[PDB]
């Protein structure tokens, strides 16, 4: 009923390291809302363990959270946006914890707070790791054999390397497989035009964010010079970005991340615009534990618009480098959401439905750092 | 955990008559979700007791509701939209009942399902009834005396009559009172320009929907030839309408109605667009009982964006011809939400927080009609 | 010379059921104007037997029709539009009966009131019934043998099924046949782009309404990614919709339905915009009797613009499961308009030129329902 | 049933001379459709007695009219448009006679073919003749005394002269009188800006076509620099002109002339665009007899859109230089439409309801010219 303690724990996870943060919102009635920010990326989000910890502990905690009723999510989300510019991941982390606390308080899974369980399970697609073309092709076949619905490749370059990678993978998987690449906005306009055209013979279902996030005119110009659908990820962050994207005709589809959107509530608003745009939405993740994947799992199962498309919320599979969750027993979440046969099933327990492995969390606290508590 | 019976009751409520419909969604575990569609308007909404009854009983009931889990609001709202074009009021009614049922099932007020109680009370303004200018001016003073925050006049015409009314009211109340008029989209472009300019000396705060709902280009042209702010009501119904409004610059403010939007969930999406447009929003009502006013009361108290502006959700005051709810003793709602000092307070009981006077409901069933039940 | 009673009859006609309504406008001089609303579609139009019956009987009858001169069509159509939002089908029905009454009064066929008999007969195309690809291809060949001018397929999905259907039909009919599909606005942007490109090898003449009625920006964006012409049906309802379509370049062609347009008079206005846009127009129907097909038959033979293109007004052929009218003898219309050799011939008698089988009409009254009369 | 003879009579009517043409479409069953093209204007329309006579007799007659069924108005109008560019007044004349013949054949007034009699009478406004401002002011007072609804002035020039005229008239008539001026597209952009601003102190209800017909950019630019509403006349001729006007926001209102539009059918289409634009429309005339006034009289009483505004169809009052029609005995129409108390009443006889004064017609044949007949 009242938040009385805000605790931020800096953790580092090895994968085969991921620097993230865990948040605990203690209430005056025993219940504790928890959340995992997921990995931190200087280029994709621009937030770090320390920026997230300071913004939550030095600002959100004393100015918005302490003494507040956690059920007032619209209110808190609004106050955080007024108080702070950007810091989407920090805000998202708090939002996740609030929903967890509220769900625990009302005795219901978070998807019940997000509109109900629209679908029982979420079909998933997966991104492959870097490697030699022959190796990436082998990993692709393994992903498909497991049941995944699409294969996504990262395009580091040079051109010769990207072409070789795509050609080998397409050769192995066949022409019926949904195969696309992600550029992370690394190309100049000319690079994009040249490379996308050189790849046309491989029939990729789409090209994800080929140009910089801010180059909306470029994305629109590109779409008028190439056949391959162009999806926006980094470009589609805020509500006004989405408006600009539809107005400039800068995309054929969209990617979302709960941390990019700024939280579950902000994600719902984000999805309202995607719906208005009548565009497909694929949700990814900020590589993290079973707790990091939970907010999205609940959202992807509840949101009617996003419930229409295959997803990419598979942080745990990336950290534990495997294709399903039965092959995972040392995650900070004792009960990692179920990943099976290419599908994600959201947990059904109260709140986010995650029980933390407290001893592992203690063992994974970032060397040289410590948890911070605010009351 | 399942809806087993859909009941629609046609009622006629005398003023000081309002033809509407009540909805009852019976679950297999005793709980019943209730809702009041409110008044029906052929020109404002285009729906009637009969259209709502048939769309709910002949379509939504067998195809979407019966046998479904009422907590799956996102899912149900989506299916109703795919199944049926328009019929926003019928859809809203179902949405209202669902939220009421879910709230009762979870033991929480609907505002908790809409993001929490952002504000404890809602400042209200009121629309005055037709009459001689002197009489209208007197009701205005009575309204302000009670604490209400603004006075809205309905402009019926002709020109000389509209000027007389506004002139008398402005004289009576003073220059520091928020006064504005509603045209309900009755003017041709020229009439608008002429009248608005003729009224300028009275410094109205705004003109509500001067042109037809579909004339967005005209609304934009108008804002180019007059000083007075132009607000859209009938023009702002669907999500794509709001997009068009912001793209064309067809409005300085917006009017919403839960029945127009299509339900609470649809209204939340509607308000996401209002937020993006950074425009004020004033919620009205389809003149009804305390039950009709409840969904809006919950939304107006929860939604962060709309919690910033004074509202106009006061149907019970109009039916019972009073300025505060202590003076209401014969409403279908045994516990009419509190209307006091110009403020609206949402009930805090589970669901919509309304207890029906089953005896009065039976007495108000529209003559010649009967309740309909579907299993 | 004066409407003295409005009668609405709810009927259900079995296939080889269709729920519609019949309208009778009795005059004080013996003449009676009749009309058939045709089938009712929750998703396509949003009107039902009850909604139409109530708007006509509870609103149009006492407020606009009773005591009025039926020849004042411009006036009545205007008042109906001021009085009621949407309800296009109900309005259309009244318009049809008025034209029938005025025609009977002047002793002339309705086409004379619509500008004269521009063409003698109307070339037709036909939509095929659902079924296995092989079965649909067989029906397609039967259709072409009778003389029909094009074959339209309803695309339901999933992708593989649509491709299978189209592939098989094209194989059987050959490359010289005009073949196209109708999506009824069921696709999201990506689905459309994907499926449309996947079907290019079958050279469809066009894709009818691939995206939602409201997604004009999507329709335009789509036209920028595919070669196949894109036609609008659901998107082209009101005059302002048509304006938006020409301004946005959202279509290569249009489809109309008298019931969608809102009546014969509004259909002429609709066609004035089609002319200005210099776009082809194919008129469909709300599947019904010879009476339902008559208003459209008169319009398609009279309107100079629409008389340039093949049409799809063949409700009686669908109800009675045949390819020509000589094979019909149990329709509510004793004299069903001539459907022969792939052409539709408007009747030449006064008004709509239809004489009802009163006995069958009484036999088809919807079980549990009853005709309504207002004086 | 069939047109067997086309007759065109060149006439010159002195005023208080006007060069026009009369048309007679003879049928094989005795009935004859008649029409008066009205005055000819080289600058406003660009057609003459000779151009009209030749286009009708040398082209329309042999290629479209002779041997055709006059009831096929949509067809005939379409064929004339395909066969001939421009020549709107000639096409209009033929259209007028067709409606007259059809009305005569069916035994109904033309307004019955145009949608019925929406209004009983047409409120009128009047344009004043040139002269000294004192003289113009007296004429204005007499006009208002008769009951006319507005006063229109012609802007001759230079600026000093226009100011004096407007100031004097405005002084004599009062502030509550609808007063405006017509420039006939005679100004360059700078002239308009200057004169309109110099006239702002007189509160003219609008400025009619201040810039050239083709200068739509200028009309839009002008509205961006002055408060006075700008109406389009010469700029609003064809359907595509109307579209360009609404897209560019070049007008606050519109003026129409049946001869400019190209006939009654083309006028109805013209008015459909006016309706879509939600703009007022004032119909003028090409100074002529009671026969020239008849087509418009029927149209202004029938068309629902134009029946909303005061009109300026008063040819006979100009030719006979009077304020009502009781004082008219020597017009080529024996029964001039009733012009009384500032209102115009359409005739109720078959067709256009006009009987020609054959003796006067022969007396008015243009000196040196003769009637032309084609079979
Ligand atoms: Ba990316
Ligand atoms: Ba309103
Ligand atoms: Ba369709
Ligand atoms: Ba002029």
UniProtKB/TrEMBL annotation, chains A, B, C, D:
<protein>
    <submittedName>
        <fullName>Mandelate racemase/muconate lactonizing enzyme family protein</fullName>
    </submittedName>
</protein>
<dbReference type="InterPro" id="IPR034613">
    <property type="entry name" value="Muconate_cycloisomerase_anti"/>
</dbReference>
<dbReference type="GO" id="GO:0046872">
    <property type="term" value="F:metal ion binding"/>
</dbReference>
<dbReference type="InterPro" id="IPR013342">
    <property type="entry name" value="Mandelate_racemase_C"/>
</dbReference>
<dbReference type="InterPro" id="IPR036849">
    <property type="entry name" value="Enolase-like_C_sf"/>
</dbReference>
<feature type="domain" description="Mandelate racemase/muconate lactonizing enzyme C-terminal">
    <location>
        <begin position="133"/>
        <end position="229"/>
    </location>
</feature>
<dbReference type="InterPro" id="IPR029065">
    <property type="entry name" value="Enolase_C-like"/>
</dbReference>
<dbReference type="Pfam" id="PF13378">
    <property type="entry name" value="MR_MLE_C"/>
</dbReference>
<dbReference type="GO" id="GO:0009063">
    <property type="term" value="P:amino acid catabolic process"/>
</dbReference>
<dbReference type="InterPro" id="IPR029017">
    <property type="entry name" value="Enolase-like_N"/>
</dbReference>
<comment type="similarity">
    <text>Belongs to the mandelate racemase/muconate lactonizing enzyme family.</text>
</comment>
<dbReference type="Pfam" id="PF02746">
    <property type="entry name" value="MR_MLE_N"/>
</dbReference>
<dbReference type="InterPro" id="IPR013341">
    <property type="entry name" value="Mandelate_racemase_N_dom"/>
</dbReference>
<dbReference type="InterPro" id="IPR034593">
    <property type="entry name" value="DgoD-like"/>
</dbReference>
<keyword id="KW-0479">Metal-binding</keyword>
<dbReference type="InterPro" id="IPR018110">
    <property type="entry name" value="Mandel_Rmase/mucon_lact_enz_CS"/>
</dbReference>
């Amino acid at each position: 009923l009242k938040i009385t303690k805000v605790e931020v724990i800096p953790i580092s996870t090895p994968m085969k390291r991921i620097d993230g943060v865990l948040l605990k919102l203690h209430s005056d009635e025993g219940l504790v809302g928890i959340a995992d920010a997921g990995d931190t990326s200087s280029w994709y989000r621009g937030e770090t363990q320390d920026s997230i910890t300071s913004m939550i502990c030095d600002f959100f905690a004393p100015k918005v959270l302490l003494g507040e009723d956690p059920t007032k999510i619209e209110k808190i989300v609004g106050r955080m946006d007024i108080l702070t510019r950007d810091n989407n991941q920090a805000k998202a982390t708090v939002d996740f914890a609030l929903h967890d606390l509220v769900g625990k308080r009302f005795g219901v899974p978070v998807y019940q707070l997000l509109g109900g369980k629209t679908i029982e399970r979420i079909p998933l697609g997966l991104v492959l790791g870097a490697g030699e073309p022959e190796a990436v092709a082998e990993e692709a076949l393994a992903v498909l054999r497991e049941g995944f619905h699409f294969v996504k490749l990262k395009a580091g370059g040079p051109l010769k390397a990207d072409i070789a990678m795509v050609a080998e993978v397409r050769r192995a998987v066949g022409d019926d497989v949904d195969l696309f690449i992600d550029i992370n906005g690394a190309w100049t306009y000319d690079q994009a035009l040249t490379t996308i055209r050189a790849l046309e013979k491989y029939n990729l279902s789409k090209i994800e964010q080929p140009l910089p996030a801010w180059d909306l005119d470029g994305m629109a110009r590109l779409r008028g010079k190439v056949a391959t659908p162009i999806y926006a990820d980094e470009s589609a962050q805020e509500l006004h970005d989405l408006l600009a994207i539809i107005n400039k005709g800068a995309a054929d589809g969209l990617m979302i991340k709960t941390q990019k959107a700024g939280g579950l509530l902000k994600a719902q608003r984000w999805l309202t615009l995607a719906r208005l745009a009548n565009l497909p939405v694929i949700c990814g993740c900020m590589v993290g534990s079973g707790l990091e994947a939970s907010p999205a799992a609940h959202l992807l199962a509840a949101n009617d618009w996003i419930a229409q498309f295959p997803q990419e919320n598979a942080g745990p599979l990336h950290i534990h480098d495997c294709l399903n969750s039965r092959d995972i027993d040392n995650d900070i979440a004792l009960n990692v959401p179920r990943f099976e046969g290419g599908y994600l099933y959201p947990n059904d327990g109260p709140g986010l439905g995650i029980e933390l492995n407290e001893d592992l969390v203690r063992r994974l606290v970032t060397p040289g750092k410590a948890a911070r508590v605010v009351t």
